[PDB]
Amino acid sequence: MNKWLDLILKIHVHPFLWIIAALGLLTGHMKALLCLLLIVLIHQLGHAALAVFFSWRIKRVFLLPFGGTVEVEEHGNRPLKEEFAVIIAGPLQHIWLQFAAWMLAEVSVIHQHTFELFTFYNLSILFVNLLPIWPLDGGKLLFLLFSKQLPFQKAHRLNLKTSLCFCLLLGCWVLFVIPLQISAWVLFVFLAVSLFEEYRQRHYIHVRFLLERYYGKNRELEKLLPLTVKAEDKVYHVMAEFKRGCKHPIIIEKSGQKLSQLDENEVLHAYFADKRTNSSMEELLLPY
Amino acid sequence: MNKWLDLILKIHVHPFLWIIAALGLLTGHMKALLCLLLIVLIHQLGHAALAVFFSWRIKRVFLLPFGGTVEVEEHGNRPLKEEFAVIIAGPLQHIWLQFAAWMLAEVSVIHQHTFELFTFYNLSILFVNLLPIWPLDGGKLLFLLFSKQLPFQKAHRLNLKTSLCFCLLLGCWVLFVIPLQISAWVLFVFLAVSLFEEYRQRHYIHVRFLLERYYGKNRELEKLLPLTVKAEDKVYHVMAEFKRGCKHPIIIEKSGQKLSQLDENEVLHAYFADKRTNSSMEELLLPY
Amino acid sequence: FVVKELVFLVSYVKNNAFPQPLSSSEEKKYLELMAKGDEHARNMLIEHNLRLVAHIVKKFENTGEDAEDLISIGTIGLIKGIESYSAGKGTKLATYAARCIENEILMHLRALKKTK
Amino acid sequence: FVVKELVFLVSYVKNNAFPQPLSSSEEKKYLELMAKGDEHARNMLIEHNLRLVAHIVKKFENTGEDAEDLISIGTIGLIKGIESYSAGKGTKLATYAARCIENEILMHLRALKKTK
Ligand SMILES: CCCCCCCCCCC(CCCCCCCCCC)(CO[C@H]1O[C@@H](CO)[C@H](O[C@@H]2O[C@@H](CO)[C@H](O)[C@@H](O)[C@@H]2O)[C@@H](O)[C@@H]1O)CO[C@H]1O[C@@H](CO)[C@H](O[C@@H]2O[C@@H](CO)[C@H](O)[C@@H](O)[C@@H]2O)[C@@H](O)[C@H]1O
Ligand SMILES: CCCCCCCCCCC(CCCCCCCCCC)(CO[C@H]1O[C@@H](CO)[C@H](O[C@@H]2O[C@@H](CO)[C@H](O)[C@@H](O)[C@@H]2O)[C@@H](O)[C@@H]1O)CO[C@H]1O[C@@H](CO)[C@H](O[C@@H]2O[C@@H](CO)[C@H](O)[C@@H](O)[C@@H]2O)[C@@H](O)[C@H]1O
Ligand SMILES: CCCCCCCCCCCCCCCC(=O)OC[C@H](COP(=O)(O)OCCN)OC(=O)CCCCCCCCCCCCCCC
């Protein structure tokens, strides 16, 4: 009743979008601007509705000249279900839009060609919003699928590599085969810029993940996953294998001999609080 | 040369260019806009890159609605060699663009229409930015040729006179043949405005040249050219006939008979430092 | 037949990594909550000021040092500084955190140099 | 022929006559080199600080004299002001230069009145 009020009064629009909309209204293209604006707005509110329901921390709902964004501040902060319930809510409003359209136009309220154009643009947007490329929407689903069976670093590297190869394939197809189609060049440029920006910060995500892992107190304890490493492995290397939403007991191996199991919280507290880092498991075995 | 990168990231754009792009995006003229922007950007980048080599005070490279502009800071205070080198940075640049277009057409990346369009636009801009007008590279070549055997002030006067005559000829031709094609009219207005500006700034340009000459550092000392003058005029009227990049041993004629030989250094120092800017030249033989 | 009529567009979520700075009023409330005993307040306080780690670490780059150790010591220094910060004196928390992290990285660098 | 379908574009270098005023750091280093002793620093400073002559001459119209002599007096007064500049007076360099230019123009006006 009050939470959504700021979301309503927080819409920002790029000035270039204003210029494009005014010129399109001027030069005939009126039946097309409304359809695209309505589709984009509906999709953005679909993204935001689940985010605000989970009591997330949104910033702004922008409207780029080539799409829309809903900036949030949760990366590696919430479990798989919380992110999935927001990501899937994007490519799930077009279904009810199509259901409304196929009944509104069939009862012959407006016209046929308008329905044809609406369906064309709607389906085109839906199938463009699922390319397995970061960030889009399919790429994040692929990242979630990887993260559930792989260590976080491994998932964040394989997803990055797959997005890179798909981006190069798309760029080759756009530049060398298809005619000009400026809407494809801008897509390629945006994808490359976003991917490079994500690569440039491949390090803070891990530390944010570990920091959030430190301060979980009875956060709905879940499956216990035995983990075993050798004795001379460094502390950072053994901490690198921490998959999301799993508590990992550590078993040390002193070249065939195991001393005792160590709790994950113990090792992580030794990392942060006691500052007993840059050492192997032997140092943590015998304290001060 | 990281100043190249600084300039390329410091490229301003006029607000009207966004409106032009918006008008060209909803109508279908992206190919022409891209070709023209590419040609103009290559021209400007070549000019700026070759200007940085000689360590000039380049301000910024910006794209005004009907072309480009490099804001070179040094006006008439340099040897003509580097000026003539930097001005030819663009007429000697379209050659490799044409070669690249030929190669791309032969490998069949682009079909057999865009190649002709690009060649037509390239060979039109090359022949437009060469007319004997000031500005445009025609003036910055004809004036440099003028300043090789004539005094600087006379060269500038004759250059502006010829530029005005040719601008009037072009305006008459446009009015007689094409009463349309707004591009010609805006080019004519630009030419007239710039001609007025460099007609109004002539005094300061000349004073800058003279002051730079006085604070010389023996920049590639060339042969010495004498100057025979009668002792009945004003000193500002004998310093006017100064050539470019030449030291002049001043020869004075007293009632038709040679009296003494004086270097430019002492007379110019007496004119500036000694404040004898409006007395005479005859008493400079025996200042004390 | 279909190409040259598609409007591609995008609709993504843009997961950022640098939270916005906290206001000048909620800081006192967060500090009081931490004083009475809380941990989510500590998380929110040490996550909002992460850009300082980047700011100082960027300055110390080009010294033949990996980013992993630099960021680890930076976060350790920030948590140490916030763990022992006193508001009685009166000073912007950003300067205190910056001094703490700079001192921590300088100490680590001196220790590493002495090791070699 | 092809004149009907043509586009005219311009790509030229515009040579400014009055360089923009320079900030404190570079003028401070130029004055430091001035103290060391160099004519090129004098040339650069007078070149960068020539706009004041234009302002003074523009506001000193309605006099009935020529322009070349006024510009020469302005620039010689500017040179006299820069060579006599001191950082201990306690005022901006631009104001001191403007005062010197006005003084020189007034001196020329008095000389012309005496001659006439
Ligand atoms: C967040 C909101 C953003 C909204 C943006 C503006 C919204 C308007 C979109 C504008 C736009 C797409 C451009 C998208 C680029 C934007 C990408 C942004 C990137 C930023 C960097 C949609 O325009 C559509 O509007 C429809 C409404 O009428 C019409 O199609 C409907 O379909 C029927 C059913 O099959 C329906 O029955 C019927 O009703 C309609 O016929 C057409 O007008 C068109 O399909 C216009 O595209 C343009 O493409 C080019 C060549 O294709 C065209 O150029 C020229 O065409 C010939 C005629 O001059 C010329 O001979 C030729 O020389 C040249 O080729 C243009 O003419 C125009 O077509
Ligand atoms: C930073 C760079 C900024 C550059 C600006 C834009 C650059 C883009 C050029 C834009 C522009 C030149 C005008 C330049 C004026 C700008 C002056 C700037 C002053 C700023 C203040 C394109 O000119 C060329 O574009 C090419 C694009 O394809 C086309 O050539 C072809 O390309 C290939 C395909 O066939 C082939 O291979 C190739 O063989 C072809 O030749 C042709 O359109 C044309 O040759 C505008 O077109 C102009 O011509 C016609 C339309 O045809 C319009 O006539 C109108 O017709 C009715 C229909 O409305 C109207 O009822 C009527 O009223 C009006 O008569 C004009 O009015 C104007 O629209
Ligand atoms: C910095 C720019 C590169 C150097 C400049 C050299 C001049 C380029 C000459 C090529 C023809 C003119 C192209 C103008 C635009 C155009 O008209 O593109 C029109 C053509 C359309 O092809 P089609 O419809 O005929 O295909 C028919 C299919 N059946 O798309 C292209 O070919 C674009 C590909 C070449 C452009 C250079 C690619 C550079 C790759 C590296 C990127 C580096 C930065 C590039 C910044 C854009």
Residue numbers in the entry:
A (entry chain C), B (entry chain A): 1 to 288
C (entry chain D), D (entry chain B): 11 to 126
What did the original publication write about this model?
S2P intramembrane metalloproteases regulate diverse signaling pathways across all three domains of life. Finally, the zinc-metalloprotease activity of SpoIVFB results in cleavage of the N-terminal pro-sequence of Pro-σK within the interior of the lipid membrane, allowing the mature σK to diffuse from the outer forespore membrane into the mother cell cytoplasm, bind to RNA polymerase core subunits, and initiate transcription of genes involved in the final stages of B. subtilis spore maturation (step 3).
To further investigate the overall architecture of detergent-solubilized SpoIVFB and Pro-σK preparations, we pursued cryo-EM reconstructions of both WT and E44Q SpoIVFB co-purified with Pro-σK. While the orientation of zinc-coordinating residues H43, H47, and D137 of SpoIVFB are conserved with those of mjS2P, the cryo-EM map of WT SpoIVFB:Pro-σK does not show any appreciable density for an ion being coordinated by these residues. This lack of density was consistent in the cryo-EM maps of both WT and E44Q SpoIVFB:Pro-σK, demonstrating that SpoIVFB:Pro-σK complexes fail to co-purify with the Zn2+ ion that is essential for supporting Pro-σK cleavage.
